[PDB]
Amino acid sequence: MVIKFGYKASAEQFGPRELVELGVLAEAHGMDSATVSDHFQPWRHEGGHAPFSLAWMTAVGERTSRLQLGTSVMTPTFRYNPAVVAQAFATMGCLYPGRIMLGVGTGEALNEIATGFAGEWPEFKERFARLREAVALMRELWLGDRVDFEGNYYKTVGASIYDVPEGGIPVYIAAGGPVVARYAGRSGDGFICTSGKGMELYTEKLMPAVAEGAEKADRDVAEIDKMIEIKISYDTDPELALENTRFWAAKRWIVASDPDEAVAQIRPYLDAGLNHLVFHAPGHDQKRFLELFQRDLAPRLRGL
Amino acid sequence: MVIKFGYKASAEQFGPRELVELGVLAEAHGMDSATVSDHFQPWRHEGGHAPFSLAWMTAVGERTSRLQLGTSVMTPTFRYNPAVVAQAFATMGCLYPGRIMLGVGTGEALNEIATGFAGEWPEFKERFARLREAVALMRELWLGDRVDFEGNYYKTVGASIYDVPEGGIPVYIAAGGPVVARYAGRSGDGFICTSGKGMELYTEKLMPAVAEGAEKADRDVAEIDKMIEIKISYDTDPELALENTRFWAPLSLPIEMERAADALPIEQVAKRWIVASDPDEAVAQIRPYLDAGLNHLVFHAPGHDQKRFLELFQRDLAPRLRGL
């Protein structure tokens, strides 16, 4: 897939209007994508906010014309009905053709417990199985009609979605290990991972797992968009570059005031075959980040 | 509450982009509000749609500046988690200050069975108990800090919503009878009913019930917005005024059902619609709802050419209504 640079909006750090305006500024400053995590719980310590992700996506969508928008990620398996998730994303894709994706993961307990999940949090195998089932259900609604989906967890009866782009909505699967990454290679339209683990995670585990799955499924691996969230504090002021990380309380972060050093720290992800770099910055001044990214980092990255 | 005229956008009848553009046109043509029904299933097979209500509300909100937006109605009790509903509406309320409401009903089986609801469909008492519980949970979230809610149906654990307007989000309750109307008087920021059902429903059952609930809760009934969906087929062409009801024929009585609807005589289809081609006659048929004390009239027009309805409404009907 082609090289793309995007922006991760931090839902824990900003209220709804500011978050939306940052997504719009992301397009203004040349980003190819903007994504948001689907949190419910606002954590006082992570900044005290949690704007609803689908409202953010839609508001930014209606204000923009090029930018790809999605979740990174949302858990479609516990506090949501997967059928309704499919409806929401199908509608958004109609509203913003060719610019919507659905990024999904296997789930975090604390948000689900907060919203009323009953009993013991399922183990990884059940969480993963639920995710594959929900993905299939949603795609069946997108592609078919009068769907009677009867899974081990989820169900529909005569369900239809007419208001959907042809072929449905790209689904991006997040993975932090090879088991789910192989699933991404078999079944995802995209793959999402996070930076700042040793580089061997990407080059020995996750990218080979995606390629394996794509082989097993008889697909061309190049058609899978390979997204990485890169945590980066960049500022030309050396003190502000460092001080911006104090909101976030191998190295997990790139912390840099020199744009060539920053680019050097990003390059290894591109060399590992991640093509869709999504930048997540800690400072309160996100407008400055977007301006500095466009001015200093993007031209150097395209120059590689 | 002050008189307002708004627009019912038909999710049943238009796909997502067209529905959004109609919402925006409602504001351009002077409407005070626009609402949408929240269904999952396309309303009918032939020409049916179901765009996701919350995406419509947000996209119209981002395109507008004055219009009040809301659901009329959504069921927050079966395929939605009420805490997530509360989050969604609180976010929208922050995005569009003073312009968002949550309109809720007790629900209908077809949409829930479609989306996986298991077992016997609850009777009215249980659907209504679930609704009241969901509303209470949402309000606790909006107005509280770290909420531990545990009801018969719904639960939260240490849950918070901090991105919410002061005072929360207005909740409007759909009422077809006195029991729910009294609850709207006690607890609703508004109530919603639909026209065409015989004037005694509004004057003898629903309005007095809202007033009684308000008095029992020590509220001023004037603070409750009294909304009615006015089913009106206005067109200066009398053939269109009648024939534009056709899409809605399923209301006037499975693939057989729809064949049966398409074959209904148009007079039968049009029975509970105001059909008018003269603007004074139209207004005469609207006026009894104002006289009954409904203050927020949301006009629902049946035909495919909704831009023409909005232009006609602004030209012919709004000035006459303001003149009452």
DSSP readout, B225-269?
EEEEEEEEEE-SSHHHHHHTTGGGGGGG--HHHHHHHHHS-HHHH
Tokens 């191998």 correspond to what residue?
A250
Q: Is the peptide bond before A73 cis (omega within 30 degrees of 0)?
A: yes
3-state DSSP assignment of residue B173: strand
Considering only CA atoms, give the Rg of chain A.
Answer: 19
Three-point CA angle A89, A136, A59, nearest 5°: 10
Question: For residue A262, which of A199, A304, A224 has the smallest C-alpha distance?
Answer: A304
3-state DSSP assignment of residue B25: helix
Number of domains comprising chain A: 1
Question: What does chain B come to in residues?
Answer: 324
Which bin fits B51, alpha (ψ -120 to 50), beta or left (φ > 0)? beta
CB A34 within 8 A of CB A60: yes
Residues 6 or more apart whose Cβ sits within 8 Å of residue B152: B129, B130, B133
Question: Which strand (E) or helix (H) includes residue B297?
Answer: strand B296-300
Rounded distance between C-alpha atoms, residue B189 and residue B219, angstroms: 11
Rounded distance between C-alpha atoms, residue A16 and residue B87, angstroms: 11
Ligand-binding site membership of A163 (annotated): no
Longest dimension (CA), chain A: 60
Rounded distance between C-alpha atoms, residue B106 and residue B192, angstroms: 12
CB B237 within 8 A of CB B198: no
Contact B52 A154 (CB under 8 A): no
CB A193 within 8 A of CB A228: yes
DSSP H helices, chain B, are 16-28, 53-63, 82-95, 109-114, 124-143, 178-187, 200, 207-216, 238-243, 255-263, 266-270, 279-291, 306-312, 318-322
Rounded distance between C-alpha atoms, residue A35 and residue A54, angstroms: 11
Please check whether residue A87 touches B, CB under 8 A: yes
Tokens 């659907």 correspond to what residue?
B127
The resolution, in angstroms to one decimal, equals 1.5
Rounded distance between C-alpha atoms, residue B127 and residue A182, angstroms: 44
Considering only CA atoms, give the Rg of chain B.
Answer: 19
Range of the domain at B286: 1-324
Contacts of A59 in chain B (CB under 8 A): 58-59, 61-62, 95
Question: For residue B68, which of B36, B90, B39 has the smallest C-alpha distance?
Answer: B36
Sign of CA dihedral B107, B110, B112, B118: positive
Please check whether residue B115 touches A, CB under 8 A: yes
Please check whether residue B146 touches A, CB under 8 A: no
User: Which residue is catalytic, options B62, B108, B267, B281?
Assistant: B108
User: Which residue is catalytic, options A21, A27, A39, A229?
Assistant: A39
Question: What does chain A come to in residues?
Answer: 304
Nearest to A84 among B49, B59, B115 (CB): B115
CB A54 within 8 A of CB A101: no
Please check whether residue A51 touches B, CB under 8 A: yes
Q: How far is CA A133 from the centre of its chain?
A: 20
- Whether B300 sits among the annotated catalytic residues: the reply is no
| CATH code of residue B12 | 3.20.20.30
Contact B79 A84 (CB under 8 A): yes
Contact B81 A84 (CB under 8 A): no
Structure-solving method: X-ray
Contacts of A116 in chain B (CB under 8 A): 81, 83, 154-157
Question: In a mutagenesis test of the B interface, which of A17, A45, A91, A155 is the best target, namely the one with the most B β-carbons within 10 Å?
Answer: A91
The 3-state secondary structure of chain A reads CCCEEEEEECCCCCCHHHHHHHHHHHHHCCCCEEEECCCCCCCHHHCCCCCCHHHHHHHHHHHCCCCEEEECCECCCCCECHHHHHHHHHHHHHHCCCCEEEEECCCCHHHHHHCCCCCCCCCHHHHHHHHHHHHHHHHHHHHCCCECCECCCCECCCECCCCCCCCCCCEEEECCCHHHHHHHHHHCCEEEEECCCCHHHHHHHHHHHHHHHHHHCCCCHHHCEEEEEEEEEECCCHHHHHHHHHHHCCCCCEEECCHHHHHHHHHHHHHCCCCEEEEECCCCCHHHHHHHHHHHHHHHHHCC
Question: For residue A221, which of A230, A231, A211, A229 has the smallest C-alpha distance?
Answer: A211
3-state DSSP assignment of residue B307: helix
- Whether A212 sits among the annotated catalytic residues: the reply is no
Rounded distance between C-alpha atoms, residue A23 and residue A217, angstroms: 35
CB A135 within 8 A of CB A187: yes
Identify the closest residue of chain A to B141 by CA–CA distance. A115
Ligand-binding site membership of B103 (annotated): no
Can you name the residues that pair with B36 across neighbouring β-strands?
B9, B71
Token pair recorded at residue B114? 């479609």
Rounded distance between C-alpha atoms, residue A221 and residue A212, angstroms: 9
Total Cβ atoms within 10 A of residue B116: 22
Identify the closest residue of chain A to B147 by CA–CA distance. A114
Angle between helix B178-187 and helix B207-216 axes, rounded to 10 deg: 40
Ligand-binding site membership of A146 (annotated): no
Ligand-binding site membership of B272 (annotated): yes
Please check whether residue B42 touches A, CB under 8 A: yes
Contacts of A83 in chain B (CB under 8 A): 40, 79, 114-116
Identify the closest residue of chain B to A24 by CA–CA distance. B62
Looking only at the bridges linking them, the beta strands covering B100-104 and B33-36 are: unpaired
Please check whether residue A18 touches B, CB under 8 A: no
Ligand-binding site membership of A23 (annotated): no
Token pair recorded at residue A233? 């504090």
Tokens 């309005």 correspond to what residue?
B207
- Distances in Å between the Cα of B79 and the Cα atoms of A139, A160, B12, B261, B308 are 18, 15, 19, 29, 36
Nearest to A94 among B15, B42, B161 (CB): B15
User: Which residue is catalytic, options B12, B39, B112, B140?
Assistant: B39
B230: closest CA of chain A, how far (Å): 27
Nearest to A51 among B116, B157, B163 (CB): B163
A120: closest CA of chain B, how far (Å): 14
Contact B94 A15 (CB under 8 A): yes
Please check whether residue A59 touches B, CB under 8 A: yes
Q: Is the peptide bond before B73 cis (omega within 30 degrees of 0)?
A: yes
Ligand-binding site membership of B38 (annotated): yes
Residues 6 or more apart whose Cβ sits within 8 Å of residue B207: B181, B226, B292, B293, B294
Ligand-binding site membership of B269 (annotated): no
